[PDB]
Design a protein around this ligand. Structure first.
Ligand SMILES: [Zn+2]
Ligand SMILES: [Zn+2]
Length: 214
């Protein structure tokens, strides 16, 4: 099961891919939104190969085109497939900072169209992007589906089983708790929280992440 999709509701699924690192499978999550105007992903995958596999799978599953991807920060698990996106005319949305960091981290450039709070609408599917502040990276954003109170946390948000923050060389560890607090403040009645890696949970993941950061 290198690529798996799991349903939250009719039109919102989690995509999860196993990257292969040092002979270990390493899952990363994003979202798949099935809209009347196409599929919209939150995040790509670790690299172009997996991104292609992901796109092939979702397009086949839903018989719909991937039209847009929202990139939640400029690391491989999120942006690794940007070349695939660009050469397919799949729009790669990001904050300007993520775009700047993408170019620095050697990736092709996403759009830089997202602000601190941005509302997008794809068909009937409403999507909010929110930059809560620095944390896992300087640029990490989260994505919210206000119709369903589903939050995509990316690597800002740890799963319940996670006991480790991960790579913090370019993290803002002190600021990360504030950024999580900002997410907790903004999103009050959450049905699901998708962490960047690991099992989907609820607000408890945000609290858990705060706990790890204490
Ligand atoms: Zn990262
Ligand atoms: Zn990650």
């Amino acid at each position: 099961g290198t690529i798996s999709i799991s349903q939250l509701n009719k039109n919102v699924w989690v995509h999860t891919e196993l990257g292969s690192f040092n002979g270990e499978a390493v899952p990363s999550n994003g979202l798949v939104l099935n809209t009347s105007k196409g599929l919209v992903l939150v995040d790509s995958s670790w690299d172009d190969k997996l991104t292609k596999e992901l796109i092939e799978m979702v397009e086949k599953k839903f018989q719909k085109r991937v039209t847009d991807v929202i990139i939640t920060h400029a690391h491989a698990d999120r942006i690794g497939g940007i070349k695939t996106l660009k050469e397919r005319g799949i729009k790669a949305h990001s904050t300007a900072l993520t775009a700047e960091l993408a170019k620095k981290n050697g990736y092709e450039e996403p759009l830089g169209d997202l602000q601190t709070v941005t509302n997008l609408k794809f068909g009937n599917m409403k999507v909010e992007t929110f930059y809560p502040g620095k944390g896992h990276t300087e640029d990490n954003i989260v994505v919210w589906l206000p119709q369903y109170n589903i939050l995509v946390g990316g690597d800002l948000v740890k799963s319940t089983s996670a006991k480790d923050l991960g790579n913090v060389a370019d993290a803002y560890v002190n600021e990360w708790s504030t950024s999580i607090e900002n997410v907790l403040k903004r999103y009050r009645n959450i049905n699901a929280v998708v962490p960047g890696h690991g099992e989907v949970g609820d607000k408890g993941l945000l609290l858990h992440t705060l706990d790890l950061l204490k």
